[PDB]
């Protein structure tokens, strides 16, 4: 069949890189703010090829009135945050959960931790440490997922592991195949 997946989350948390790596098997060479972009892809499940319609959105508040146009008929929504920026995890509870429940009631939500490669990146550890902070831990991610009612919590690194990215869509597809 066909599955519609929409990806939301704060600006620069890694939404576009995640989608580009999965659909185009290519990591973006530069950063360009996204408004809307649509990608097509297909995933095989138990001797079956499912067609995926993927929607990239803007993490910017300036597009709060535009973003909702992509929600209708969504099978699953991936809420992303940046493991290297704890503040982006707060947005999941403060903004994203409420927006999805408002426009996508009954849709399956998946909490996705992006840029896992930075959790052990020395420069990042040092910068965060100089301000009494640490990268988001797996446990913090998992607890947030339960708090907002997400089907599950999963992490990835579009930069270092293409497989971690494919796993996300593998799970997303399964969560929809059996609604
Ligand atoms: N270290 C690391 N950097 C990443 C990873 N993914 C994306 N980035 C970097 O993070 C920046 C923003 O990533 P994007 O994918 O464009 O972010 P976005 O969430 O789509 O941003 P908006 O369109 O503004 O909402 C870029 O400079 C990427 O190169 C990742 O897995 N690891
Ligand atoms: Mg983007």
Swiss-Prot record:
Gene Ontology CC: one annotated term: cytosol
Membrane topology, as annotated: Peripheral membrane protein
UniProt binding sites for GTP: 9-16, 56-60, 114-117
Any one of the GO BP annotations: signal transduction
Tissue distribution: Ubiquitous.
Location of the motif Effector region: 31-39
Keyword Membrane: yes
Location of the protein in the cell: Golgi apparatus membrane
Keywords noted in UniProt: Golgi apparatus, GTP-binding, Lipoprotein, Membrane, Methylation, Nucleotide-binding, Prenylation
GO molecular function: GTP binding; GTPase activity; protein kinase binding
Function, in words: Binds GTP but lacks intrinsic GTPase activity and is resistant to Rho-specific GTPase-activating proteins.
Family membership: Belongs to the small GTPase superfamily. Rho family.
Subunit and partners: Binds ROCK1. Interacts with UBXD5.
UniProt-recorded name of the protein: Rho-related GTP-binding protein RhoE
Organism of this sequence: Homo sapiens (Human)
First and last residues shown, out of full length: 22 to 200 of 244
């Amino acid at each position: 069949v066909k599955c519609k997946i929409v990806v939301v989350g704060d600006s620069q948390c890694g939404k576009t890189a995640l989608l580009h790596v999965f659909a185009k098997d290519c990591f973006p060479e530069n950063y360009v703010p996204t408004v809307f972009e649509n990608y097509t892809a297909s995933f095989e499940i138990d001797t079956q090829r499912i067609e995926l319609s993927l929607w990239d959105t803007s993490g910017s508040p300036y597009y709060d009135n535009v973003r909702p146009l992509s929600y209708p008929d969504s099978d699953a929504v991936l809420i992303c945050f940046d493991i290297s920026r704890p503040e982006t995890l707060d947005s999941v509870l403060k903004k994203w959960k409420g927006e999805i429940q408002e426009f996508c009631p009954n849709t399956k939500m998946l909490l996705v931790g992006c840029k896992s490669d930075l959790r052990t990146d020395v420069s990042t550890l040092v910068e965060l440490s100089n301000h009494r902070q640490t990268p988001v831990s797996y446990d913090q991610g998992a607890n947030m997922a339960k708090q907002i009612g997400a089907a599950t919590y999963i992490e990835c690194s579009a930069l270092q592991s293409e497989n971690s990215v494919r796993d996300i869509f593998h799970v997303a597809t399964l969560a929809c195949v059996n609604k």
